[PDB]
């Protein structure tokens, strides 16, 4: 993968992140695309932002950790963009996405667990 | 039945007239003697709707003993309309009815300090501190001792207030402010550290300690004091705003932006943190930051004042005047918003807008401001009016 | 299945020099332990109570923000001179302790910097024009740097993996570095070449720390097994096991028995060397313990950090929560006590590094 | 290791059409013819003498298939639970928000990860002295958490 994509999750961590992204997009609480993810991170409404290491170029996803330095949000990089695209439900591969917080959503505990598990990978 | 009659009198005073409400209040006062609540309601109805208020105050003093609030309202109505040495004699007669020096002694000291012969006010403050020392009574005595000159008697009174009221951080903050105006500066820092270790959670005392540690150089100790103040609450918005201001005062603008981002991530529902994040951001990037602060923390006076300052900085007075009017209508008790509105009226506009801003500032007294408390706590402008303090706050911007 | 490999003669000469420099150091440490054991229990208990009372009143000091990048490691200079910090950017500034003033920021890196640990005799018996500190980045680089040059030195290109941490030997001629290639390198300062590449773990080593005498050297990484190798002929017999997570911090006590290891399973392992067992499994914090620092030559405490906003200063021995050194806003990455024992610096992920000091 | 394979609604709809078509064809043809790390938490409560709260804590420990112990002493109640991450999160959410204690307050002393479980089942131990509770915790190899809880209680009572 790309060395500039940091931090990188494991296999089960990427599976849990894809399941959380599918549960957020199925409940109309996720934003696909890097532009919508960075806009939700700059707006202060994005709970978590996930990236992908299989992006061409890999520097275009480099705004996703830097926005994590601008809003104090946990960031993570997936292994492939095609699995994140299917996880988002979009046939096109997704190199970036965002799980945003809602007004008392049922998946808030899973989003908090994903944010607690993704913050320990960057060490 | 008396509560229903008082509610019907309040509804009649709010509805159509004031004669029937005064008649119902007189009937409720002449039917049976009540507590101080009915007397305070009758005094408020007499003040909101000269001689009748003085007669009601005399009837409350003659029929309802041990009523300090009604006696203080009657003394204020006698000093405003009737006479100041008559209100002084009324307060001296009320001192023989209530021997407690909680609120009558402070009101008598304020009435003696509003006029001349302040040595009698200092003697009354010393007698109130030696008879029944309290927190606010010792704070007012230390303020009256330090407004004239920084004598050693003021330091002894501050030491006695710190020994008798160590749980109250106001006496420690007053002792630190008195020692900061002396020749040395280590005693003020020691008193501020003792007040921070004895409260243990004192936000303005730790803010004054951080200001003293930053103004005397070696501001890493000031940043450590700000971090200890933010962790001692824990996660205080005022300590985080003070740490962001201390980081923005130096050459580390990116560290101040990171501290503001951490304060927004730890407390998004803060007006002062949103104003600091809107002021520390870029000028073409503030149009989205102000919208995010309005969407996150709506109906806030600090966010509205920051939006008014951003509209005035963008050479748009027609939007800045409406933003200042909305900030004055949302919360008229703010000092920084009123000072910014007065500065915007004095910078761009006719004299009618400045006169309206001065009337709005003189109607409701501003408090708890960032720039208002810097001039309202100093000894040079402690016994000044609201208009001179507003002019000094507007001229220092 | 302990595999053996033939090494060069320079590695054997450096091992013999390390043994000849560590054996009188171990003899002096045993003599100091015997002199401390001859002291009565009342004076030692009074000194321990005074140390606990000094550590309980630990206030924050020397808090200065480095840059916009979060701080990853911090190492205190000898004789209470300064403190070298290493953030996530390419700059490695050195705050003048206790004033925490930025002066002579060492730049030259591109990726996220790892552990910038100075020499144990840099400010004492070494010149500032020569190499005084050694830093590493997220790529393969172990770069030396001075204190008054603002430029790196000739690095060693023998590492091609993510060098997480690096620690210089107390003798000064050697320096260990934990890489991500399932091995740990031991570079030399006199020969200016990599003398040994110890590969005994299943995963890449994270933190490496040598003993106070220079004979033993602790290891640890993502293989969930702690290793304690010898500088004479290898043959690590003190294998630490029990942690189910990745060991992110190792600290060697000045006493020859106790050794504190920090793992990611929210616990700390204080193991003995004369018995080769786990003496204490201390639940320090709830987050992953990354930073861990032993006491100075007095040997009374241990400061273990975590991925939370706090850091636990515990007694040694006893494993009691003596001090909760909170105050940070992010993950506390990197902490080290000074040579005097009156102050202990600690960095965090909030782009600032503070210190706990006596009031 | 395995990754979830999700599709869009349209793709699924196509599958439905095919599925129904296949079903119709078939129909028409039928008519025509805790290991690898366990989360271990330890909480400290001021008073656990209530029978209803203790019964609710025992029911939450038994229904979540989590083992451990609940030791009681003089104003020091150490409740140690051990199991999966979701069971420990549900037990912490029940003991922190659902279990209403109130001077009696319950706080989580520690929450870490161990290799395997120490206790077999949740047994409500009782000891008036701290030495008996320390010996009962050291018999199962959990004396460090009890010592940390006692030190935290002593630091809360002193400060």
Structure characterization notes:
It is classed as splicing. The entry lists the keywords spliceosome, splicing. This is part of a larger assembly, with chains A (123 residues), B (397 residues), C (359 residues) and D (159 residues). Chain A is of the alpha+beta class. Chain A has helices at residues 11-26, 34-43, 63-71, 81-88, 108-118, and strands at 30-32, 46-52, 75-78, 96-100. Chain A has a single domain, classed as 2-Layer Sandwich (60s Ribosomal Protein L30, Chain: A), CATH 3.30.1330.30. Chain A has a 4-stranded mixed beta sheet, with helices on both faces. In chain A, helix 1 runs parallel beside helix 4 (81-88), helix 1 runs antiparallel to helix 5 (108-118) and helix 2 packs parallel to helix 3. Chain A starts with 10 loop residues before the first helix and ends in a 5-residue tail after the last helix. Chain B contains 24 helices and no strands. Chain B has helices at residues 2-15, 19-31, 36-48, 51-63, 68-82, 84-95, 104-114, 118-131, 135-148, 152-164, 169-180, 186-198, 203-215, 220-232, 237-249, 253-266, 271-280, 286-296, 301-313, 317-330, 335-347, 351-363, 372-376, 386-395. Chain C has helices spanning 9-37, 41-56, 122-125; strands at 58-65, 71-76, 83-87, 94-96, 101-102, 117-118, 133-136, 142-145, 165-168, 174-178, 184-188, 194-198, 209-210, 216-218, 228-230, 247-252, 259-263, 268-271, 278-282, 292-294, 301-305, 311-315, 323-324, 335-337, 343-347, 352-358. Chains in contact: A-B, A-C, A-D, B-C, C-D. Chains C and D meet through strand 19 of C and strand 4 and helix 5 of D.
């Amino acid at each position: 993968v790309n060395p500039k994509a940091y931090p990188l999750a494991d296999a089960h961590l990427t599976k849990k992140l894809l399941d959380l992204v599918q549960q957020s997009c199925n409940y109309k609480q996720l934003r696909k695309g890097a532009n919508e993810a960075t806009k939700t991170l700059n707006r202060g409404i994005s709970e978590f932002i996930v990236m992908a290491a299989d992006a061409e170029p890999l520097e275009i996803i480099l705004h996703l950790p830097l926005l994590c330095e601008d809003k104090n949000v946990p960031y993570v990089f997936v292994r492939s963009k095609q699995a994140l695209g299917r996880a988002c439900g979009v046939s096109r591969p997704v190199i970036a996405c965002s799980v945003t917080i809602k007004e008392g959503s049922q998946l808030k505990q899973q989003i908090q667990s994903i944010q607690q598990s993704i913050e320990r990978l960057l060490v | 039945r008396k509560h229903t009659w008082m509610e019907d009198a309040d509804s009649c005073v709010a509805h159509n007239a004031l004669e029937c409400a005064r008649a119902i209040y007189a009937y409720a006062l002449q039917v049976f003697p009540s507590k101080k609540s009915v007397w305070l309601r009758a005094a408020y109805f007499e003040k909101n709707h000269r001689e009748s208020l003085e007669a009601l105050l005399q009837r409350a003093v003659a029929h309802c003993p041990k009523a300090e609030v009604l006696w203080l309202m009657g003394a204020k109505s006698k000093w405003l309309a009737g006479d100041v040495p008559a209100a002084r004699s009324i307060l001296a007669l009320a001192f023989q009815a209530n021997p407690n020096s909680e609120e009558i002694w402070l009101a008598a000291v304020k009435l003696e300090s509003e006029n001349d012969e302040y040595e009698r006010a200092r003697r009354l403050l010393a007698k109130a501190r030696s008879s029944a020392p309290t927190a606010r009574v010792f704070m007012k005595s230390v303020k009256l001792e330090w407004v004239q000159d920084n004598i050693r008697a003021a330091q002894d009174l501050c030491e006695e207030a710190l020994r008798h009221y160590e749980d109250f951080p106001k006496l420690w903050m007053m002792k630190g402010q008195i020692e900061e105006q002396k020749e040395m500066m280590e005693k003020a820092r020691e008193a501020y550290n003792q007040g921070l270790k004895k409260c243990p959670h004192s936000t303005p005392l730790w803010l004054l300690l951080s200001r003293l540690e930053e103004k005397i150089g070696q501001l890493t100790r000031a940043r450590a004091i700000l971090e200890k103040s933010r962790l001692k609450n824990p996660k205080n918005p005022g300590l985080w705003l003070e740490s962001v201001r201390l980081e923005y005062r130096a050459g580390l603008k990116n560290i101040a932006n990171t501290l503001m981002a951490k304060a927004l991530q730890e407390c998004p529902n803060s007006g002062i943190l949103w104003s600091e994040a809107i002021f520390l951001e870029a000028r073409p990037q503030r149009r989205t930051k102000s919208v995010d602060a309005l969407k996150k923390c709506e109906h806030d006076p600090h966010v509205l004042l920051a939006v008014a300052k951003l509209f005035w900085s963008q050479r748009k007075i027609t939007k800045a005047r409406e933003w200042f009017h909305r900030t004055v209508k949302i919360d008229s008790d703010l000092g920084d918003a009123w000072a910014f509105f007065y500065k915007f009226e004095l910078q761009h506009g006719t004299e009618e807008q400045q006169e309206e801003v001065r009337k709005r500032c003189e109607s409701a007294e501003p408090r708890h401001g960032e720039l208002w408390c810097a001039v309202s706590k100093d000894i040079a402008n402690w016994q000044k009016k609201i208009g001179d303090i507003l002019r000094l706050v507007a001229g220092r911007i | 299945q302990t595999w053996y490999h033939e090494g060069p003669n320079s590695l054997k000469v450096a091992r013999l020099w390390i043994a000849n420099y560590s054996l009188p150091r171990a003899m002096k440490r045993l003599e100091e332990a015997r002199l401390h054991k001859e002291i009565p229990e009342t004076t030692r208990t009074s000194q321990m109570q005074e140390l606990h009372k000094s550590l309980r009143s630990l206030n924050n000091f020397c808090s200065q923000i480095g840059d916009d990048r979060p701080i990853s490691y911090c190492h205190f200079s000898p004789n209470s001179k300064m403190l070298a910090t290493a953030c996530w950017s390419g700059l490695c500034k050195l705050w003048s302790v206790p004033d925490c003033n930025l002066l002579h920021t060492l730049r030259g890196h591109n990726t996220n910097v790892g552990a910038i640990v100075f020499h144990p005799k840099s400010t004492v018996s070494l010149d500032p024009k020569d190499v005084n500190l050694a830093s590493c980045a997220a790529d393969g680089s172990v770069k030396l740097w001075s204190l008054d040059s603002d430029e790196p030195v000739a690095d060693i290109e023998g590492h091609t993996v993510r060098v997480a941490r690096v620690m210089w030997h107390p003798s000064g001629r050697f320096l260990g570095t934990t890489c991500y290639d399932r091995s740990w390198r031991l570079w030399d300062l006199e020969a200016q070449e990599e003398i040994l590449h110890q590969e005994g773990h299943s995963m890449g080593v994270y933190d490496i720390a040598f003993h106070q005498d220079g004979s033993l050297a602790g290891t640890g990484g993502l293989d969930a097994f702690g290793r304690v190798w010898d500088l004479r002929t290898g043959r690590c017999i003190m294998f630490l096991e029990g942690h189910l997570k990745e060991i992110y911090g190792i600290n060697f006590s000045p006493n020859g028995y106790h050794i504190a290891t920090g793992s990611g399973d929210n616990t700390c392992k204080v193991w003995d060397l004369r018995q080769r067992r786990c003496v204490y499994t201390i639940p320090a914090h709830q987050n992953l313990v990354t930073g861990v620092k032993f006491e100075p030559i007095h040997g009374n405490f241990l400061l273990t950090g975590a991925y939370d906003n706090t850091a636990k200063i515990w007694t040694h021995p006893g494993w009691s929560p003596l001090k909760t050194l909170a105050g940070h806003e992010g993950k506390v990455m990197g902490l080290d006590i000074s040579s005097d024992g009156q102050l202990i610096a600690t960095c965090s992920y909030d782009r600032t590094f503070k210190l706990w000091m006596a009031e | 290791v395995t990754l979830g394979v999700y599709l869009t609604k349209k793709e699924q709809k196509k599958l439905r059409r095919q599925t129904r078509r296949e079903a119709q064809k078939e129909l028409q043809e039928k008519v025509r013819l805790i290991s690898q790390g366990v989360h271990i938490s330890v909480y400290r409560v001021r008073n656990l003498s209530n029978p209803a709260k203790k019964f609710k804590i025992e029911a939450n420990a038994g229904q979540l298939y989590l083992t451990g112990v609940v030791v009681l002493h003089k104003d020091v109640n150490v409740v140690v639970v051990e199991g999966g991450p979701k069971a420990q999160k549900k037990f912490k959410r029940l003991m922190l928000h659902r279990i209403k204690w109130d001077t009696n307050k319950c706080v989580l002393v520690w929450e870490g990860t161990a290799k395997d479980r120490s206790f077999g089942e949740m047994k409500f131990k009782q000891c008036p002295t701290e030495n008996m509770a320390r010996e009962h915790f050291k018999k199962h190899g959990a004396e460090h958490y009890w010592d940390l809880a006692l030190s935290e209680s002593v630091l809360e009572s002193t400060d």
